[PDB]
Design a protein around this nucleic acid. Sequence first.
RNA 1: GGUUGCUCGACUGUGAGAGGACCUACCCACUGUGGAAACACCACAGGAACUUCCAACCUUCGGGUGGCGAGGUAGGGCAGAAGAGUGACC
Lengths: 215, 222
Amino acid sequence: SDIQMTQSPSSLSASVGDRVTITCRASQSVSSAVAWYQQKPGKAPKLLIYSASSLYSGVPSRFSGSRSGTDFTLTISSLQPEDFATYYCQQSYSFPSTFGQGTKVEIKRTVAAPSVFIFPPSDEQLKSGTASVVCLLNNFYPREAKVQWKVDNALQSGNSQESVTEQDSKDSTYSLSSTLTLSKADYEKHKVYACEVTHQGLSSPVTKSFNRGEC
Amino acid sequence: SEVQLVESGGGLVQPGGSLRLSCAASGFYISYSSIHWVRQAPGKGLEWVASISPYSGSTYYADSVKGRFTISADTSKNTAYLQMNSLRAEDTAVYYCARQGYRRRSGRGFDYWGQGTLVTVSSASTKGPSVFPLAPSSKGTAALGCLVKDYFPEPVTVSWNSGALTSGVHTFPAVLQSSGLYSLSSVVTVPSSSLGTQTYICNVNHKPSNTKVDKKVEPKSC
RNA sequence: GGUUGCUCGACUGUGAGAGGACCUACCCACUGUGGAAACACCACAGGAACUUCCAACCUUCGGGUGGCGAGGUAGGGCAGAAGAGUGACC
């Protein structure tokens, strides 16, 4: 039977200099064969704690492990901005080894309104019959934002896709790229393409826009 | 320290097929340590895969791969291998290699990791990205970028001006076009003045296709 | 013929709480620390406790020293001994 590592919270937003506690509960006694890792996006994991309480060589003293029965708890006394990371527990007391589902941490800063620009599809693209309109929301916070495409003042729906950067660990902010996509024919049917951003830092919804053709 | 781990042998693979991932050890000899594979499906979490034991070559498997994967090591070559047969879609992941440290120092922690090789089990075929330019405008800084459209599989890489332009650059994570292909775009912001005098090229590399594209990004032509 | 000493002894024994600690070698084991060591291989320390014992060594005979894997397989130790003798004595 597999020892389960059940770790909560799934996610944690907190202020710089807060105390953050992440908990992991092993379905069976695993002695102190528990270790804690810090993984930042696209990087390989890094080791933090290794005998449920023992701080790995070089790890800042603000990190610390702890066992209580089958409850293991990592603990950062004061968040630094760099500590933005998904944290995992692992049990290595039996085979198969087992990891927690991990806990994504976020920085917290004052409000930053998005910078907004809009990009009309490039001339090379339209030759090949495709037509992507891109809208950029730059260096804002908090990430919760609402982008709305209007084509000749028609709200679009189901033809936009967006992706978001992680928290720039120096900036503690976000950027978003919402991309409207159409056939060349659908593009050539409408003059005005507008991108309507609503964000907490903006007291009023900011719209950048263009007309098809203007030089 | 010189302690390093280098995975290799991943990539696009049809369902039902096989791969053999390699892990190349640099700063230490693997014969004195326990060596483990750990994978991570995209934006999911860490999953333990297999491990082999020093001095005994005892091998231990995750049950989701048991009998389809095999772990091993060649002392002489200071390499550890992982033979993956009869792969399925969910085998898709970055497959990491890690050294269980020396007990006196780090207990049973995994104290060195590779950068992991990405394994992409699918039948859909490789395509390289059309690269389009996101031209700037008026209104003291503006933004320009590149659109990396309709490629597969991940990853592409974007650098600006051959890596000389690093500051202010946001390369968005690909999203999955309904074509199954990937699209993404990269953007940098620059003070408006540089427009007329500063050459701005993004550099786009999609190794799965062997596609390298350099797109000079210039302002509105008129 | 008793009786009883003396010697060679087939062979059986080593008895577990109201009572079992003899030695050695191989194998096979059980438990923890350590060996760049989660298992395997290695070295080492240990077989719950209180007790029981001295087959072992030392003694001034007061007592002391040392000693437990109830695993097999063999060689011995110690205890009997059926049988052989063999005396003394009646």
